[PDB]
């Protein structure tokens, strides 16, 4: 079998915690079983299952924090865009489009005109 994420996501926080325990007891048992038996590939699907459950539990807690920090100066560094270290400290579009009172006046009064040769 193997648990599906899209089904995990409908469960409660505490349902997921419990299925995590359930799978852990499962795994423990299987490993006893394994050392009395020529093979045990069933075991693979349950450690994969634990993976997925944790993945899902983690998703939801992150997604929780993410929103209760939405629209704030300052939110934890690991919900901040990764991007690149350079990219991260490049001037913003604002501080970059910045233009001098004097020069904005200039741009307005004498901007590159559209013209054409011919007649």
């Amino acid at each position: 079998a193997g648990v599906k994420a899209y089904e995990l996501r409908t469960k409660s926080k505490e349902q997921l915690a419990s299925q995590l325990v359930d799978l852990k007891k499962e795994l423990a048992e299987l490993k006893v079983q394994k050392l009395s038996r020529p093979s045990l590939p069933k075991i693979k699907t349950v450690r994969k299952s634990i993976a997925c459950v944790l993945t899902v539990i983690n998703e939801q807690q992150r997604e929780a924090v993410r929103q209760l920090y939405k629209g704030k100066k300052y939110q934890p560094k690991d919900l901040r865009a990764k991007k690149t270290r350079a990219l991260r400290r490049a001037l913003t579009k604002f501080e970059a489009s910045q233009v001098t009172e004097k020069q904005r006046k200039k741009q307005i009064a004498f901007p590159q005109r559209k013209y054409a040769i011919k007649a």
Binding site: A81, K82, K83, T84, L87
Partner: protein, 87 residues
């Protein structure tokens, strides 16, 4: 006696394992690696030792993170998730 009868007395490491490069060039009494230069912040290497540099530059290891920067660049460092379609 300078030959083999004196080779019998070789039972003490001048160098052990170097935490930073694992190489067994950590000089005990000097407390510094003869290969990678640890614990100097910078990493030992020299322009007259190109074969040396080759043996250790980026790419001779996992590139656990640099691996993926290309793909990330190509998709314009996108964020969010992908949506869905059909069939």
């Amino acid at each position: 006696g300078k030959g083999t009868p004196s080779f019998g007395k070789r039972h003490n490491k001048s160098h052990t394992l170097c935490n930073r490069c694992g190489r067994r060039s950590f000089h005990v009494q000097k407390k510094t690696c003869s290969s990678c230069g640890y614990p100097a912040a910078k990493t030992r290497s020299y322009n007259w030792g190109a074969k040396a540099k080759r043996r250790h530059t980026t790419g001779t290891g996992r590139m656990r993170y640099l691996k993926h920067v290309s793909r990330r660049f190509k998709n314009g460092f996108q964020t969010g998730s992908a949506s869905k379609a059909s069939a």
